[PDB]
Design an enzyme around this catalytic site. Structure first.
Site, short mmCIF file in Angstrom:
data_model
loop_
_atom_site.label_atom_id
_atom_site.label_comp_id
_atom_site.label_asym_id
_atom_site.label_seq_id
_atom_site.Cartn_x
_atom_site.Cartn_y
_atom_site.Cartn_z
N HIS A 7 0.85 -1.15 0.00
CA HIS A 7 0.00 0.00 0.00
C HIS A 7 0.90 1.22 0.00
O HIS A 7 1.71 1.42 0.92
CB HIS A 7 -0.92 -0.01 1.22
CG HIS A 7 -1.93 1.11 1.24
ND1 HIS A 7 -3.28 0.89 1.38
CD2 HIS A 7 -1.78 2.46 1.13
CE1 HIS A 7 -3.92 2.05 1.36
NE2 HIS A 7 -3.03 3.01 1.21
N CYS A 61 -4.30 1.55 -4.21
CA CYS A 61 -5.11 2.55 -3.53
C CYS A 61 -5.14 3.75 -4.45
O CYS A 61 -4.19 4.54 -4.47
CB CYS A 61 -4.57 2.88 -2.14
SG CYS A 61 -5.60 4.03 -1.18
N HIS A 64 -8.21 -0.58 -3.30
CA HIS A 64 -8.94 0.39 -2.49
C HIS A 64 -9.42 1.36 -3.54
O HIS A 64 -8.74 1.58 -4.56
CB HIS A 64 -8.07 1.17 -1.49
CG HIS A 64 -7.49 0.36 -0.37
ND1 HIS A 64 -7.79 -0.97 -0.15
CD2 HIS A 64 -6.61 0.71 0.60
CE1 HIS A 64 -7.11 -1.41 0.90
NE2 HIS A 64 -6.39 -0.41 1.37
N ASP A 93 -13.38 1.70 1.48
CA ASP A 93 -12.22 2.23 2.23
C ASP A 93 -12.24 3.73 2.57
O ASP A 93 -11.91 4.56 1.72
CB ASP A 93 -10.91 1.90 1.51
CG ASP A 93 -9.72 2.64 2.09
OD1 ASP A 93 -9.74 2.92 3.31
OD2 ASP A 93 -8.79 2.95 1.31
N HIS A 94 -12.56 4.05 3.82
CA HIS A 94 -12.82 5.45 4.21
C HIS A 94 -14.16 5.91 3.68
O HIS A 94 -14.51 5.64 2.52
CB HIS A 94 -11.77 6.43 3.69
CG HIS A 94 -10.45 6.33 4.37
ND1 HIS A 94 -9.97 5.15 4.89
CD2 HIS A 94 -9.48 7.26 4.56
CE1 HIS A 94 -8.77 5.36 5.40
NE2 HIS A 94 -8.45 6.63 5.21
N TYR A 128 -13.55 5.53 9.37
CA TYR A 128 -13.90 4.13 9.28
C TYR A 128 -15.30 3.70 9.77
O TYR A 128 -15.48 2.56 10.23
CB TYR A 128 -12.79 3.33 9.92
CG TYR A 128 -11.74 2.88 8.95
CD1 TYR A 128 -10.50 3.47 8.92
CD2 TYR A 128 -12.00 1.85 8.07
CE1 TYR A 128 -9.54 3.04 8.05
CE2 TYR A 128 -11.06 1.43 7.19
CZ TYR A 128 -9.84 2.01 7.19
OH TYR A 128 -8.90 1.55 6.30
MN LIG Z 1 -6.56 3.31 1.02
#
Ligand SMILES: [Mn+2]
Ligand SMILES: O=C(O)[C@@H](O)[C@@H](O)[C@H](O)[C@H](O)CO
Ligand SMILES: [Mn+2]
Lengths: 349, 349
Positions: free
Chosen positions: A183, A221, A250, A294-295, A309
């Protein structure tokens, strides 16, 4: 063909948001989680991992990604002793391979996993979110290791440290059956005097080149990379796909330029990423893995105290991606799947 | 060529706030109606402004008045109809004097909807509305006045009769609607067949055709509720949707997902592979035909501890639909050669 499993991050027994709830996000297949009862660099036992699995399947789901076996600062420093910590990563990998989980996700970010100025930053539509005030407090020490990076460890010093790292873990990852997914450093640039190597396209191409395997890959991501405007996600996503080296999506959205960044709603036009294009690629490349929203934003009453989250907007992201993936599949002369088996429980015809 | 993303709001009493409604990504318009006049009476502009003032202050815009209730005395063809059409006159006129382009409504004897079960369990652990024909066999449906209204429709009101009273009422209020702006949108019956000896006449393709023709004019149209009509398997909602798009006859889109059979029908996730409706097709049609109105994800499951005791009006799965549709529209828009659009102006404050 694209077997793209929609997923959610879940922090286990101690999460604000529960497994049952996640279950109720239509199309939801995967759980993304980690063993949290064991010190960094220390080695995950099979039983911490089988205890998460046992739960997750109990609520009709499956762990698709182990998000983050934490990479210890010693390894990230390359200190003489790392082999000790490094072997604990191998046992961790192995044992993941031993719980039937296809993908472990990590980062080689020195000291700071993320940097966030505002956790409550307003947005046009009335929601708050996470943003990166490039000016505000930033460019100042956040009150031993730091000065080591500040002083001696160069990018190439960190690079070699990382080369060392993954050169040691991979043949393991290959026999475990586990694909590694680095990541990106978040934000995609060095700050606080510390180095960030994993910055964009060329970085990925050197990274991928460190060990030449599908097992050695990235977690794309798309929102992280993209929050420095110098890097461009579509061609970046495209590239990894081309070479067959994405093992985790992501897929969150964020807005930016030469001023800094703010996290926003998932929907293509609340930010710089055209999310349609991102997925349309996952279609054309028959990509196979897990994407998480994600988020999210804090909206409604989301008492989720931990940062980005909470359930609500994250779930909003997810069906938006469901809609995106549903669409392009058909548009592609294909038939999209969401793991749904029964429509009803106790009628049918 | 743009569809405005809309959402229904029960007025000041709605346990779901406008802030929460505003919080949905790409959400734009508001679907609401007055609640302080008994039934078959007038609607003073004052009541409609007292609701429009509350809304555009919170970011939103009445895109439809979801339901001025046609009196039973009207549908029943009873003599005293003309006056209660005189008060439905004002309503119609006063609304178009507040920019709102569309008014939804129905011509359905005795009940606006029927369900055997307001919490039927679904496979992903949640609960949604369902009409199980068998559970409602052994039921005999003011109260005495009801035993009276029902008796009339059963005995002295045929189907042809109900068509009769719809036409008289329609050629009445159509001029009122054209001298006001307001486009008129009929809701199909739910279920789209007769139950409890009672007749229904807004049931399918055959019937849509007769309706449009009752008064060949663009402000004489329908609410296309794919969900209502797909509760009956013999119906083909994809062809129904196309047909009416061609005649410029869709003045508002409900977009809800059901599963069905000889057994009856159960409501499900908005996502296609959860029910019996290929949603992607329905929005695709909405994009092939440059459709200009507004779409409301309708009803939602009972997910995540949601304590809303109203049919399917909770915020969450109603809002999860919204964003699924956000995905499907956009996703299709870009495969066409069209650029989508939502409530989006300034990405950042
Ligand atoms: Mn991420
Ligand atoms: O066809 C239906 O039943 C729906 O359109 C509902 O919106 C209905 O009009 C009621 O408001 C639900 O209780
Ligand atoms: Mn409806």
């Amino acid at each position: 063909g694209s077997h793209m499993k929609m997923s959610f991050r879940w922090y286990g027994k101690k999460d604000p948001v529960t497994l049952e709830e996640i279950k109720a996000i239509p199309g939801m297949q995967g759980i993304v989680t980690a063993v949290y009862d064991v010190p960094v660099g220390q080695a995950w036992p099979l039983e911490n991992i089988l205890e998460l699995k046992k739960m997750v399947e109990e609520a009709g789901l499956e762990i698709t990604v182990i998000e983050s076996i934490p990479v210890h600062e010693d390894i990230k420093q390359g200190k003489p002793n790392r082999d000790a910590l490094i072997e604990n990563y191998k046992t961790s990998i192995r044992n993941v391979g031993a719980a039937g989980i296809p993908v472990v996700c990590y980062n080689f970010m020195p000291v700071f996993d993320w940097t966030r100025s505002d956790l409550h930053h307003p947005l046009p539509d009335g929601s708050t979110s996470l943003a990166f005030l490039k000016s505000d407090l930033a460019g100042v020490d956040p009150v031993a290791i730091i000065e080591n990076y500040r002083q001696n460890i160069s990018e190439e010093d960190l690079w070699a440290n990382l080369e060392y790292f993954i050169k040691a873990i991979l043949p393991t990852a290959e026999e475990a059956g586990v694909k590694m997914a680095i990541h990106p450093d978040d934000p995609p640039y060095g700050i606080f005097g510390l180095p960030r190597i994993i910055t964009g396209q060329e970085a990925v191409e050197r990274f991928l080149n460190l060990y030449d395997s599908e097992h050695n890959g990235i977690t794309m991501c798309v929102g992280s990379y993209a929050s420095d405007p110098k890097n461009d996600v579509l061609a970046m996503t495209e590239y990894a796909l081309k070479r067959n080296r994405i093992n985790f999506m992501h897929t969150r959205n964020v807005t930016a330029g030469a001023w800094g960044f703010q996290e926003t709603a998932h929907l293509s036009q609340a930010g710089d990423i055209d999310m349609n294009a991102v997925v349309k690629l996952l279609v054309d490349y028959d990509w196979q893995g897990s994407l998480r929203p994600d988020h999210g934003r804090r909206i409604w009453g989301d008492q989720t105290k931990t940062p980005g989250y909470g359930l609500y907007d994250r779930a909003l992201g997810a069906t938006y991606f469901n809609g995106l993936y549903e669409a392009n599949m058909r548009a592609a002369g294909k038939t999209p799947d969401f793991g749904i088996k029964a429509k009803t429980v106790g009628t049918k015809e």
